[PDB]
Design a protein around this ligand. Structure first.
Ligand SMILES: CC(C)(COP(=O)(O)OP(=O)(O)OC[C@H]1O[C@@H](n2cnc3c(N)ncnc32)[C@H](O)[C@@H]1OP(=O)(O)O)[C@@H](O)C(=O)NCCC(=O)NCCS
Ligand SMILES: Cc1ncc(C[n+]2csc(CCOP(=O)(O)OP(=O)(O)O)c2C)c(N)n1
Ligand SMILES: [Mg+2]
Lengths: 474, 239, 95
């Protein structure tokens, strides 16, 4: 008949009574007692819950058993504030962003014990106790359970955000408030629209690999969520009343982008020259009355060389329209690979032009197709940065790391990144964490150099098939 | 369909045989939880005196065991048993209170019951010496056949491993078996801090059971016996 | 003195027959209360992952059941039984 807050102040825990009725001719009482002791120990054991979570594919560390901390001088409210800062700043380090259950050997791992409640002298016994949270979530007081659910929804699900390095208080608070408002529950209609784009992306990939020869180099298999990601951004820009989107990209997935994003007919695409030419098309929105031109820029095989050229194309088109400071209606959508983005110096050299008087174009939307490989080289030999997209922290720009096997989270990030660009006029970086299904070329076994990574890749469901089975299950 | 089959032999054959014979005793069990706080405190005062004097340590089973003897003397029906004498149902009233201690022996594990004889004429120091004599000789294999016979009442401690309470079996020839359970706090308090529990006033407990032959001992008598044990564990004269 | 009388038949006759045979097994019971707080918390984390992924829900009996198997492997005597083989008392160790 007691209240949950009064019981939480004492520290009353739930119990289970277990009995053992045994044949005394072959089992003695001491053995039966030891058996029940082991069961009690197991139900509060670290290894036991690690084994269950591993089996059920829960990509989080379980709650740990601990004794309720004794009442010394230590204040818990100021330590709840320190935990809130830790999640805002580094919560992306434990976010479900990798579609593979893969940790690259060779890459150093930063310590993030500050994300565990035990480091701030708080235990499971504090979950239903109330604390002062200093205006967090627009509230003065909150329970630690409510603090953790809000922090987990905002920063540890399929989107890992990096934004606290932003200096301006107004821009940093806008991102904070939108990320802590949460990712909206998608409607059934929205879910069917995403399923149609994924069907189109995979149908095209299967046509290319089976009807043409020597296309394994150019496969988008493992990164098919790029199609609804680019569509989301271009569609959001059309709703903002903008005039054109200029794309700069390498070879991977280029013909897929030409058919499903630019809108060229199949006859026009098929008549490696096509992989370097430019094109023009139109994008109409299904749920609106906006239109937007979509262009693709020509480029050589030298990766990232299109970056400065593409920015210049955008600036010339903006100057011809001449709509002033509140204009900037030609959106640059620039695609990269993870190895090339981190390694080639032209990438940050071009981003340094983003706010300059003669080079400003209202910000660039960057998409890094992070397939955690570059030919036969893994990230441990490609960069000294934690994430591939870390040049963003140098320019005071936000980064959104999103799981390429959750298309709902991928379309949301596309929309938010395009909304951020129109409001603040700065660059935005999307790290699409995916994988590369085939080798770098036709005559290459990727297991020769990376056998452990390709144990997780070979024979898994595609993003389309996995998403259909996931919707049917829930 | 071929599991391992190994014949039960030796002392284990004797335990199994007695468990089969025990099926003829209609038993009932009484369960009572008792405040153990004063036991924790006063046992610590005795052990602190001994560590500063000539060593030695007394256990909770020594105290409960002595309280059990005082309780059997206050309620003598608990020391009686049933037997068929002259083809008739009869009540057996023993001459002495021979307390059988369930000692868990190492193998070359087996639980055997050795008796502390004539406990009704002993003070605590004589009871403690007699108890330690039985446990000492069992550890060095120097028990005789006379040590295993004449048991009138028994005491077992499943609480050492952490069992809350048990419903044990009663061996033929005795009227009751007493079981001592876990002296931890209940499970709902096992993750709590000592200062928060001290502010409410949560005390430690011990659950004691009484499994008795219903043909010669009634439930009300068994309940009164457990009440006297609880009263003794918090009594001024006892300590 | 006429109460309702109805013969016990089917599966219920089998349950009643086995309960009569069970009278030949001398049993004892051990009782232990265990902290369940961490079970409530960690079961909720697994079910929250499943509701967001492909559905399904795990129960407390699934967890306790698996803990019971780990405990029987740590204490194998709990998996043995008694039988009279060759007219002698014997210990049955299952495979
Ligand atoms: O049996 P015994 O004669 O009581 O004594 P043991 O040799 O088993 O004593 C070993 C430990 O078990 C503890 N113990 C024994 N019976 C117990 C019970 N029923 N509940 C809880 N702890 C118990 C004792 O307190 C002792 O711990 P401590 O001496 O550090 O305080
Ligand atoms: C400037 C330049 N240097 C080297 C190469 C050779 N090359 C072609 S693809 C490739 C690896 C690309 O890795 P990543 O950027 O991760 O792209 P992915 O193929 O994984 O999409 C390299 C080194 C190149 N094309 N351009
Ligand atoms: Mg790559």
């Amino acid at each position: 008949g007691a209240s949950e807050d009064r019981l939480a102040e004492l520290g009353v825990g739930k119990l289970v009574t277990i009995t053992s009725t045994y044949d005394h001719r072959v089992i003695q009482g001491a053995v039966s007692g030891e058996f029940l002791r082991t069961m009690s120990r197991l139900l509060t054991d670290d290894s036991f819950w690690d084994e269950i979570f591993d089996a059920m594919n829960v990509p989080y560390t379980p709650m740990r058993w601990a004794q309720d901390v004794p009442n010394t001088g230590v204040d818990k409210n100021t330590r709840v504030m320190q935990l809130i800062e830790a999640y805002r700043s580094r919560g992306h380090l434990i976010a479900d962003t990798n579609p593979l259950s893969w940790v690259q050997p060779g890459m150093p791992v930063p310590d993030h014990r500050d994300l565990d409640i035990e480091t701030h002298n708080l235990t499971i016994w504090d979950l239903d106790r109330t604390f002062n949270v200093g205006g967090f979530g627009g509230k003065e007081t909150m329970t630690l359970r409510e603090v953790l659910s809000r922090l987990r929804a905002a920063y540890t699900l399929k989107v890992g955000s990096e934004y606290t390095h932003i200096l301006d208080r107004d821009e940093r608070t806008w991102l904070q408030d939108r990320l802590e408002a949460g990712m909206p529950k998608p409607t059934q209609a929205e879910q069917k629209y995403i399923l149609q784009k994924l069907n189109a992306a995979e149908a095209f990939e299967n046509f290319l690999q089976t009807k043409y020869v020597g296309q394994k180099r150019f496969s988008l298999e493992g990164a098919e969520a790029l199609i609804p990601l680019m569509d989301s951004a271009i569609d959001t820009a059309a709703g903002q009343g903008l005039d054109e989107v200029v794309i700069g990209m390498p070879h991977r997935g280029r013909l897929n982008v030409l058919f499903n994003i630019v809108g060229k007919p199949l006859a026009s695409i098929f008549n490696d020259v096509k992989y370097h030419l430019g094109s023009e098309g139109q994008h109409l929105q299904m749920f609106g009355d906006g239109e937007i031109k979509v262009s693709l820029t020509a480029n050589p095989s030298h990766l990232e060389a299109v970056n400065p050229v593409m920015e210049g194309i955008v600036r010339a088109k903006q100057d011809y329209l001449d709509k002033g400071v509140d204009g900037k209606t030609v959106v640059p959508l620039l695609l990269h690979g993870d190895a090339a983005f981190a390694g080639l110096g032209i990438v940050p050299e071009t981003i340094n032009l983003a706010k300059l008087r003669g080079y400003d174009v209202g910000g660039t939307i960057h998409i890094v197709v992070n397939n955690q490989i570059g030919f036969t080289t893994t990230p441990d030999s490609s960069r000294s940065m934690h994430y591939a997209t870390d040049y963003a922290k140098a320019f005071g720009c936000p980064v959104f790391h999103v799981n390429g096997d959750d298309p709902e989270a991928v379309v949301w990030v596309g929309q938010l990144a395009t909304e951020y660009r129109r409001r603040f006029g700065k660059d935005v970086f999307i790290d699409l964490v995916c994988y590369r299904l085939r080798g770098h070329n036709e005559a290459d076994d990727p297991s020769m150099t990376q056998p452990k990574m390709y144990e997780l890749i070979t024979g898994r469901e595609t993003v389309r098939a996995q998403y259909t089975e996931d919707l049917l299950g829930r | 369909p071929e599991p391992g089959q190994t014949p039960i032999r030796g002392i284990f054959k004797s335990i199994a045989k007695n468990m089969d014979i025990s099926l003829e005793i209609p038993t009932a069990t009484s369960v009572r939880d008792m405040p153990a706080r004063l036991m924790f405190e006063n046992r610590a005062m005795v052990n602190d005196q001994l560590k500063r004097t000539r060593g030695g340590k007394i256990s909770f089973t020594h105290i409960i065991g002595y309280a059990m003897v005082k309780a059997v003397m206050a309620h003598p029906d608990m020391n009686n048993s049933y037997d068929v004498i002259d083809g008739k149902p009869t009540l057996i009233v023993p001459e002495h209170i021979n307390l059988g201690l369930a000692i868990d022996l190492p193998q070359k594990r087996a639980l055997v019951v050795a008796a502390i004889k004539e406990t009704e004429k002993m003070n605590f120091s004589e009871f403690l010496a007699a108890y330690e004599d039985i446990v000492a000789r069992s550890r060095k294999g120097k028990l005789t056949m006379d040590d295993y016979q004449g048991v009138t009442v028994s005491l077992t401690n499943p609480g050492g491993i952490g069992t809350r309470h048990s419903v044990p079996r009663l061996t033929k020839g005795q009227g009751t078996i007493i079981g001592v359970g876990s002296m931890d706090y209940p499970a709902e308090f096992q993750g709590a801090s000592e200062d928060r529990l001290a502010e409410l006033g949560v005390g430690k407990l011990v659950t004691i059971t009484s499994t008795y032959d219903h043909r010669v001992i009634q439930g009300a008598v068994s309940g009164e016996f457990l009440r006297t044990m609880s009263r003794l564990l918090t009594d001024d004269s006892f300590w």
